[PDB]
């Protein structure tokens, strides 16, 4: 379960740079490796790579 935006608000700094929450960065890592694993299982990858 990925929480809503209220639990991880993207606070805007003095300028326009929108800083993301720690939860959002972590979910970014999770989605990155999840997609990476999904393609590695779908396409050519070694068993140790998938592991």
């Amino acid at each position: 379960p990925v929480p809503p935006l209220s639990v991880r608000p993207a606070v805007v700094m003095q300028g326009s740079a929108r800083n993301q929450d720690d939860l959002t960065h972590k979910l970014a890592d999770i989605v990155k490796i999840n997609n990476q694993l999904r393609r590695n299982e779908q396409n050519g990858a070694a068993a140790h790579v998938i592991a």
């Binding site: 393609r39 779908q42 396409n43 050519g44 990858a45 070694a46 068993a47």
Partner: protein
Amino acid sequence: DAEFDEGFKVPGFLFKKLFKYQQTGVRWLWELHCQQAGGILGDEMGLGRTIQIIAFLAGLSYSKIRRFEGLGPTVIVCPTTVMHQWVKEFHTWWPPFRVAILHETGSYTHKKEKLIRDVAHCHGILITSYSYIRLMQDDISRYDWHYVILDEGHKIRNPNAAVTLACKQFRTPHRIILSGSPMQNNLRELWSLFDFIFPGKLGTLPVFMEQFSVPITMGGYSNASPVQVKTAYKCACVLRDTINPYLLRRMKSDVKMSLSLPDKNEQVLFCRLTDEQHKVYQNFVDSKEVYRILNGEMQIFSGLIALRKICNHPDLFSGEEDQFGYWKRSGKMIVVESLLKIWHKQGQRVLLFSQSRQMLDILEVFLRAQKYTYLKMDGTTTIASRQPLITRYNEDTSIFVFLLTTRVGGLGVNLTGANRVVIYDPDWNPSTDTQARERAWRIGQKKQVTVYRLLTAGTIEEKIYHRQIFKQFLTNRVLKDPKQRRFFKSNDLYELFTLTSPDASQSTETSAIFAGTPLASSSLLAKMRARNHL
């Protein structure tokens, strides 16, 4: 009428029209049909593969071989630019096939699913685009198709694309691919094509990679240990004989004596960077961005695109006689100036290619700065008006240079009136630049055509050309002969964020690399021990 072994009465008044290689191909297609397997007509362009397919399907329909009384419903998936051509081919060879196109233009004027249902109900010949396979992948695959022909089946080159999945969702044992090149970049593509035509032969993609692709490429480097190259050769042989009875590929070497072919010469010009361009490229390769690329913290791909832009022209990367795209600020356009001037004085006609459409527009502005008459066709031009442009270039001489990117237009748009061709910048794919040079030099070319590939030495672009040659070598080893002289180094080939422009005291990197230029259980055992000692 010609007759085959089990009985396949290809009609005489068609079979006589074919050429010898064409009849061999019809034989092979029917051998597959008996085995109930698929295959790849890997004959490169210009031999005529559509003729073989219509010939075989017509023979299969008239012969009434049987499931289905004769030939059942068949789907042909081809690019849009050739569908109408296909239906015309059928209608001129074998009229009684009720051929029908699935398209917005079409002829049905009603619900398209009703077209699928009707055509399947009449065992017709249905032609689609790849996009319609992808979109109606669930609907179109319910009517028990008897043949699937993926014309230009290299659209299936990627085993991840949705078009590949949609095409592999067909059920029939009969899958034929008509591709001029089954593999273009690496062995991902060969496996995908074979997973289509014959789902099991080559293993699952992981197994196929770890058995073939890695040992092979590791044996494609000149610094490989002897064991590595020997293993690469052995695995290449195994793959070659594994794919042998399902890939029918014929070159323009055996069939050359049947059709004429004017000589083609090709050069690779190495264009020194201009001092401002040189400074910009050196600043980029010394800036912190490429350092972060080497750290892996940023995606290397922007660095590639930036360096390609720099080598094309500084105005791309950076952004009178000082307006946008001034041709003196990059050496490749200096060379293009010289060649265009000389060729115009010679009265010839030019094809001017480039992967980038932005620099295609730069070059357009440059041609306006000169007095050359020209014509442009790119992706921005509407497709419905593409044919007129080509015809107008081909019919007259009052147009000098035609502007292309390597990938616009249907495969092999007929640009015959051109005499000289220039590839302004190389691409990663060998097949696209090969297609670029092939587009001018086709069947029915009157004059000797020469290709000039423009390189910037010591830059990213030299490395792009090296990679193109490497992939070409890989494909050649897989498809024509495993034994090959090794040209390249692993680290030099892969490291591509440096600058060593030649000073003419030392030769260029490319020339330095190319410096030289029943079984009786004993034959079975002999072949096994032979393969194993390698």
